[PDB]
Amino acid sequence: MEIVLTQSPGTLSLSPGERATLSCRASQSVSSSYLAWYQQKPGQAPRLLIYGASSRATGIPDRFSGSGSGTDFTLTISRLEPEDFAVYYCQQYGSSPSTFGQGTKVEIKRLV
Amino acid sequence: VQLVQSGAEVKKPGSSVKVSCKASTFSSYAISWVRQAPGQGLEWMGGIIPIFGTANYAQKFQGRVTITADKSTSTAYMELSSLRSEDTAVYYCAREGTTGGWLGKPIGAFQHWGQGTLVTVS
């Protein structure tokens, strides 16, 4: 039975400099914390940020971190930079078939 | 490590499409196919370790996806049949990362991605 991953929120509206916390909930415990996070910008391929729940991929800056085990995982961007507005996906690869969350769009807050 | 895919295709409903991905080691690492529709996120279709020559599929696509590989050309292929409007998507080939050459341990997550291939079903 495939593991379903559900992200929240669907959209996160924030200002540059703010902390972004994104959640990924699995329907079943994720084997060995084999959980990754990706960033994707429009018309570009995804980029790996985090693997093994908490390990940063090569070249990924210190402001990205991942945490969690079992069924609840979190990607945090400690202080959002303008280049960080994008869509973020989680993925489990502990069990067949590999499955992805539906994506959380991190976007700039509308003008007051 | 670069993955370069074939160009966009527009297909008739009920036809089949075959997309390629050229890698630039090839035989020893898992290559997967992942798709993405307009505005379902990313969706995993299957994967192949070319050295073993056989594929593993998501049950969702079993019976109509074929994943193959060619060692001499360093090319992976995904063929999807009986196309429906819901199959309109960008199809990506992805390869797992390694910590390394052969000093690297594979890490499962997709470090390398092709540029994607848009398949539109009329």
Numbering used by the authors:
A (entry chain L): 0 to 27, 27A, 28 to 110
B (entry chain H): 2 to 25, 28 to 52, 52A, 53 to 82, 82A, 82B, 82C, 83 to 99, ...
The article reads:
An effective HIV vaccine will likely need to elicit broadly-neutralizing antibodies (bnAbs) that target the viral envelope protein (Env) as part of a protective immune response. GEPs showed detectable, but extremely weak, binding to soluble Env gp140s and extremely limited neutralization potency, though some reverse engineered epitope-scaffolds (ESs) showed robust GEP affinities, well above the B cell activation threshold. Reverse engineered ESs are ideal reagents for studying the binding properties of GEPs. Multi-log improvements in affinity for ESs were the result of improved off-rates or combined improvements in on- and off-rates, with a small number of enhanced contacts to antigen observed in the crystal structures.
